[PDB]
């Protein structure tokens, strides 16, 4: 570490999570320390800022919000403070997915602040009309059979949409127990085995059947207006996505309130297994001259009294206790952006399912040291599998080739 200020009066924090403004103010009231919190951009926008500040050797914050998939990019280059010694016993505090996701090469480099265990959200009105019981979709085969019944409703009806999304693909291979990205040798060696990984191949085989039999909406782009439209008019009947989705449903698909339900993700063989999609953490920059004060802040937000405030504003929790809290587990409504409670899931205690989804997450999935690059070019190689007849496996092989070449150029010892 560099030299450390003795009398710390303020710290600098970069984060786009809007709820952190009030949590920071609460922290200032408690400790007398000023928190200069700036939203310098959302995810990759902020990461570009971090990259430049690291390049330039100045201007970096003391703390930064970083999504789990992007942490290795900074941890492996030594740009994040190793906080392992300050987190003894935290393994019992955090849910398995988030806790696994803040560790790189056996060391903790951030604290979880929100999570996104995957869940199966479905339009019960459409499923019932198709003759599908959404509470009995336990295996990927069940989902395939449901997909045929839903599409039987009409040529414009689809169990879900997928036009090619790197995060979705990665999350589904995670769920299948895939480990196509493995970093070894203290961060120097990277094995990319997308083509040979058994989990990856299992998802490819399953998703390829839906693609080949024309059972997926492959044209609607995620988060587009046609996407929310499809969800509200029934042509997109369900979503395989993270536990944070309910907040977006209530505000962006208000017409369908009461028609949807949530269930656990179907798994290849019905085994207990799940993945995460999205979610973020707070990390201390290795360059910080205020390391201890920076850690104290993220400890309050991620581990102390800031956690309850965060959950109460609508963040999906990353810790075990919040999942069982009586102000969380018994929810049957979601507050919209105006504060109005909406019964979006028809009375279901949706957080009980999402709590179980958290417990099921597998803990052996690893991210690349260059996920931002990898996910940005995913569409360059897999797009043809959605606009055309390219087998997913063929696109994934080309993707792997580009990632291995990029890895070598960055200094890693690549294995195939």
């Amino acid at each position: 570490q560099p030299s450390q200020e003795s009398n710390v009066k303020e710290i600098d924090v970069w984060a786009w999570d809007p709820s952190l403004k009030q949590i920071a103010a609460d922290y200032e009231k408690k400790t007398g320390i000023k928190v200069n919190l700036k939203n310098v951009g959302t995810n990759t926008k902020e990461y570009t800022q971090l990259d430049n500040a690291i390049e330039a050797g100045s201007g970096a914050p003391d703390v930064a919000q970083i999504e789990y998939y992007a942490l290795p990019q900074y941890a492996i280059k030594g740009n994040l403070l190793d906080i392992t010694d300050k987190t003894s016993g935290y393994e019992d505090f955090y849910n398995p997915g988030p806790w696994s996701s803040v560790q790189i090469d056996g060391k903790v480099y951030a604290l979880p602040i929100d999570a996104g265990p995957m869940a199966f959200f479905y339009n019960k009105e459409i499923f019932d009309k198709a003759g599908v019981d959404g509470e009995k979709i336990k295996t990927w085969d069940d989902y395939y059979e449901a997909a045929k019944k839903i599409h039987a409703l009409g040529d414009e009806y689809y169990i879900t949409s997928d036009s090619g999304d790197a995060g979705f693909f990665d999350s589904m291979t995670w769920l299948a127990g895939g480990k196509p990205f493995q970093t070894t040798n203290n961060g120097k060696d990277v094995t990319i085995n997308l083509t040979g990984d058994n989990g990856v191949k299992e998802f490819e085989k399953f998703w390829q059947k839906l693609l080949d039999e024309k059972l997926l909406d492959t044209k609607t782009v995620g988060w587009s207006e046609d996407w929310f439209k499809g969800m509200q008019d029934g042509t997109i009947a369900s979503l395989l996505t993270g536990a944070w989705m309910p907040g977006n449903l209530v505000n962006s698909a208000p017409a369908a309130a009461g028609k949807w339900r949530v269930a656990l993700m179907p798994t290849p063989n019905g085994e207990k297994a799940n993945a995460e999609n999205g979610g973020s953490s707070l990390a201390v920059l290795k360059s910080s001259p205020k390391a201890q004060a920076a850690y104290d802040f993220i400890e309050y937000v991620a581990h102390g009294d800031g956690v309850k405030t965060h959950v109460e504003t609508g963040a999906f929790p990353a810790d075990k206790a919040s999942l069982e809290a009586d102000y969380f587990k018994n929810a049957t409504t979601i507050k919209n952006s105006d504060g109005k409670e909406i019964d979006y899931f028809g009375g279901q205690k949706y957080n009980e399912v999402l709590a179980q989804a958290s417990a099921d997450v597998l803990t052996g999935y690893q991210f690349l040291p260059f996920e931002v690059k990898a996910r940005g070019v995913f569409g360059d190689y897999l797009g043809k599998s959605y606009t055309g007849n390219q087998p997913l496996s063929e696109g994934v092989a080309a993707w792997q080739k580009a990632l291995i070449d990029y890895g070598k150029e960055q200094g890693f010892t690549m294995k195939e």
Side-chain angles (χ1 to χ4, degrees):
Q1 288 174 81
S3 73
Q4 297 296 298
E5 279 194 28
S6 288
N7 188 3
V8 170
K9 302 261 172 65
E10 57 274 320
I11 63 171
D12 290 310
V13 183
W14 289 1
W16 64 86
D17 182 346
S19 64
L20 294 182
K21 292 211 160 283
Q22 195 49 48
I23 296 174
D26 296 342
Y27 185 78
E28 297 175 327
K29 185 185 199 294
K30 175 188 197 207
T31 67
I33 294 183
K34 304 172 181 194
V35 182
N36 183 358
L37 178 73
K38 298 183 183 151
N39 179 345
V40 306
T42 298
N43 43 69
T44 51
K45 304 279 268 292
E46 189 197 272
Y47 306 157
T48 303
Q49 298 302 323
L50 285 172
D51 295 346
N52 297 339
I54 292 158
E55 169 66 6
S58 78
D62 301 295
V63 177
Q65 177 182 9
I66 306 175
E67 296 168 297
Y68 299 118
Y69 78 82
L71 276 173
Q73 179 166 306
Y74 301 100
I76 283 157
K77 288 192 259 298
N79 295 321
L80 299 185
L81 183 67
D82 172 5
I83 57 172
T84 304
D85 53 356
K86 295 166 180 169
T87 65
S88 116
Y90 285 17
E91 66 211 48
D92 308 323
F93 184 91
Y94 291 103
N95 295 321
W99 189 241
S100 180
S101 295
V102 297
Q103 297 183 63
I104 294 91
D105 192 29
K107 299 158 141 169
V108 181
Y109 287 99
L111 292 188
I113 55 163
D114 64 274
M118 284 189 79
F120 172 41
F121 303 86
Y122 64 94
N123 181 334
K124 184 172 179 296
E125 186 182 71
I126 296 289
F127 271 56
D128 288 351
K129 172 128 155 232
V132 180
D133 186 353
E135 295 304 318
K136 302 201 287 237
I137 312 295
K138 307 304 175 191
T139 69
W140 283 1
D141 186 63
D142 296 341
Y143 187 91
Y144 164 69
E145 293 291 329
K148 288 191 283 187
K149 287 180 170 150
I150 286 158
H151 190 54
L153 290 174
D155 288 331
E156 71 266 53
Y157 289 89
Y158 295 101
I159 187 160
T160 198
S161 66
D162 177 20
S163 52
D165 181 278
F168 174 70
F169 181 92
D170 287 327
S171 290
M172 292 294 288
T173 61
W174 180 346
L175 182 138
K179 289 160 223 201
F181 312 134
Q182 297 165 24
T183 301
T184 55
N185 192 25
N186 297 103
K188 301 169 202 133
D189 301 353
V190 176
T191 294
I192 302 180
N193 186 28
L194 285 156
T195 58
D197 181 89
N198 301 133
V200 172
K201 293 168 62 165
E202 218 185 346
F203 172 62
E204 286 176 331
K205 183 168 174 73
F206 162 61
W207 218 237
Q208 193 68 71
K209 186 164 55 174
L210 282 50
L211 252 20
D212 290 348
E213 302 186 10
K214 307 294 191 233
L215 300 170
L216 261 19
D217 174 1
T218 60
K219 310 305 154 210
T220 306
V221 178
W223 302 100
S224 72
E225 270 309 312
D226 289 351
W227 187 67
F228 286 119
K229 184 196 302 333
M231 254 148 72
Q232 288 178 95
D233 82 338
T235 49
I236 301 178
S238 63
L239 302 173
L240 310 171
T241 193
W244 40 255
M245 186 57 82
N248 296 278
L249 288 181
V250 62
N251 290 311
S252 298
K259 298 182 26 170
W260 284 69
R261 305 290 190 271
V262 58
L264 299 182
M265 285 291 296
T267 64
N269 319 291
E271 71 278 17
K272 168 165 176 273
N274 198 18
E276 307 221 302
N277 183 268
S280 82
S281 70
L282 292 174
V284 179
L285 277 291
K286 181 83 151 295
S287 59
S288 175
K290 305 170 180 185
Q292 188 59 52
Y295 180 79
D296 293 339
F297 169 73
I298 69 170
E299 189 284 332
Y300 174 88
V301 177
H303 188 265
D305 287 332
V307 177
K308 182 169 175 289
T309 309
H310 205 202
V311 174
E312 287 179 326
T313 66
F316 189 81
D319 68 296
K320 298 180 185 176
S322 297
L323 293 179
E324 310 307 330
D326 59 10
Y327 54 82
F328 179 84
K329 143 164 54 44
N330 307 292
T332 65
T333 55
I334 305 162
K335 283 186 199 149
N336 70 5
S337 57
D338 283 330
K340 191 198 183 192
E341 294 183 23
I342 303 304
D343 188 0
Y344 201 94
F345 298 116
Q348 177 176 24
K349 286 189 187 305
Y350 57 92
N351 281 333
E352 280 177 4
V353 179
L354 302 176
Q356 185 65 61
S358 299
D360 298 359
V361 175
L362 306 176
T363 61
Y365 185 84
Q366 287 182 23
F367 302 104
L368 288 170
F370 39 92
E371 278 292 337
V372 169
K373 166 65 183 182
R375 288 165 183 239
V377 302
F378 173 87
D380 304 341
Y381 299 100
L382 275 299
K384 292 182 220 291
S385 292
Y386 294 89
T387 67
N389 303 326
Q390 186 192 247
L392 294 167
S393 67
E394 185 188 324
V396 169
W399 191 32
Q400 179 168 306
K401 178 61 160 66
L403 301 178
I404 282 166
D405 295 338
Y406 184 84
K408 293 194 218 142
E409 297 169 347
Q410 301 309 300
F412 302 94
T413 299
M414 302 313 295
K415 294 104 164 291
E416 190 115 11

